[PDB]
Design a protein around this ligand. Structure first.
Ligand SMILES: [Fe+3]
Ligand SMILES: [Fe+3]
Ligand SMILES: [Fe+3]
Lengths: 194, 263
């Protein structure tokens, strides 16, 4: 009744293939290792496509035409699947067969998704806000602010406009962190992390 | 036993305060690393009841000591201001060779000496007794986990935050009986419970989703072992971080007090 662990035993045996969809085929379907990878693979799928549902307008409801080539692309470029995970998907889209169909209706949700992710996972005591910039978003930026009040009726991620304009980043995206909950200094765009 | 509820999202405050007013919960367990930047007094003044701390993304097994110490120092004064009933953390594999796992992995329980060293270092930084939660295993590591926690808790002085839903997932996924945790259940006074889902492509593999009411075997687990669970100062926190509506939580809380009534 239990599913066999067939070629492995513990989770530590499957660490390397938890984000490699091309490596799921080498496990027996009836095995538990196949399902463990499928659970982890669906976690990447749902984190990307439940947060950015309009990406499914490009790939289709299965999302395979984006998911499988990106997961292979991210393993080659040694991505870390950090808070910049969504932004790297957009960078891959710019070199893919969907590059002609990329507009601001697709750029904005992935920008607020990366700001929202950094919001929830980052644990730097000295970092209160993240500011996301883009060459496809001049004059504005996406600001992710950690919670500093339990009674704030606003979203923690906002699109803000800059009076004096900010230089467009070198790559498609750029970021910088603020010590507090105010932007009084532009330190220079930092390149997107892995 | 005291019944608690986990406070994770800032938008659920109005419902949790109502649960306290109607005496549906006795305390509130918090994902305290999510609210590390707001004033610690304002958040103690938001709940007219005791609170408990639950740390999620400390990553003390792998985080750099410099950034880990900064988090501990901040959590230390949250402990000072609020005086939580307990402070709890996890044993989880977050990163493999630099890539972040979106489905967190069960650590290899054969790495005791490494886990023991990181646990004593993290418990020292928090300056209190730390409780560690068990994993809802999918692979066969569930069989060697009960003796792993009993050894870790014996040498480092940590407690165990026993999640009944997680052990029920382990029994369903690998056959490891929940009775392996009997000795831990009769020792620790703090517990977790929640509903669990199923793997999409396989209804036999169970996953901790915290989005449903409690299962049938999870309720029978608490019922037939109400003596080993119930103790002086015993607490159990119902977890629901997805599908957060008042009524599906209300029935599960009532089923919880139905198992553990006063004397
Ligand atoms: Fe937990
Ligand atoms: Fe739990
Ligand atoms: Fe759980």
């Amino acid at each position: 009744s239990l599913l066999p662990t067939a070629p492995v035993r513990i989770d530590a045996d499957l660490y390397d293939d938890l984000a490699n969809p091309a490596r799921q085929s080498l496990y027996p379907r009836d095995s538990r290792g196949f399902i463990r990878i499928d659970i982890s693979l669906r976690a990447y799928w749902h984190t990307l496509f439940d947060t950015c549902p309009r990406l499914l307008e490009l790939s289709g409801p299965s999302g395979g035409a984006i998911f499988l080539p990106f997961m292979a692309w991210a393993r080659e470029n040694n991505l870390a699947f950090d808070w910049s995970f969504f932004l790297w998907v957009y960078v891959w889209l710019q070199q893919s067969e969907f590059r002609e169909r990329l507009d601001e209706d697709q750029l904005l949700p992935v920008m607020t998704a990366s700001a929202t992710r950094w919001l929830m996972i980052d644990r730097d005591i000295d970092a209160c806000q993240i500011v996301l910039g883009s060459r496809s978003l001049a004059g504005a930026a996406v600001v992710g602010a950690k919670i500093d009040s339990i009674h704030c009726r606003l979203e923690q991620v906002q699109q803000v406009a800059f009076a004096a304009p900010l230089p467009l980043p070198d790559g498609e995206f750029g970021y910088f962190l603020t010590p507090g909950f105010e932007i009084d200094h532009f330190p220079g765009w930092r390149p997107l992390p892995r | 036993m005291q019944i608690g509820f986990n406070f994770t999202l800032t938008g659920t405050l109005d419902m949790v305060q109502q649960m306290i007013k109607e005496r549906k919960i006795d305390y509130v367990e918090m994902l305290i690393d999510n609210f590390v930047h707001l004033p610690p007094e304002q958040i103690a003044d938001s709940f007219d009841c005791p609170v408990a701390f639950h740390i999620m993304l400390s990553k003390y097994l792998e985080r750099d000591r410099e950034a880990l110490a900064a988090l501990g120092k901040r959590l230390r004064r949250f402990i000072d201001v609020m005086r939580p009933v307990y402070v709890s953390d996890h044993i989880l594999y977050f990163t493999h060779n630099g890539r972040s796992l979106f489905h967190l992995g069960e650590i290899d329980y054969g790495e005791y000496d490494h886990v023991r060293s990181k646990v004593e270092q993290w418990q020292d930084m928090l300056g209190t007794r730390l409780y560690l939660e068990n994993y809802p295993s999918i692979m066969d590591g569930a069989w060697d986990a009960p003796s792993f926690y009993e050894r870790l808790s014996r040498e480092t002085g940590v407690g165990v935050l026993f999640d009944a839903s997680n052990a029920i997932c382990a029994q369903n996924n690998t056959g490891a009986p929940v009775e392996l945790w009997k000795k831990i259940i009769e020792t620790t006074r703090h517990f977790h419970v929640a509903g669990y889902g199923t793997a999409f492509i396989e209804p036999r593999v169970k996953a901790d989703t915290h989005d449903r009411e409690m299962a049938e075997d999870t309720l029978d687990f608490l019922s037939r072992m109400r003596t080993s669970f119930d103790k002086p100062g015993a607490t159990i926190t119902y977890e629901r971080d997805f599908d957060i509506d008042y009524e599906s939580i209300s029935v599960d809380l009532k089923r919880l007090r139905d198992i553990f009534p006063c004397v």
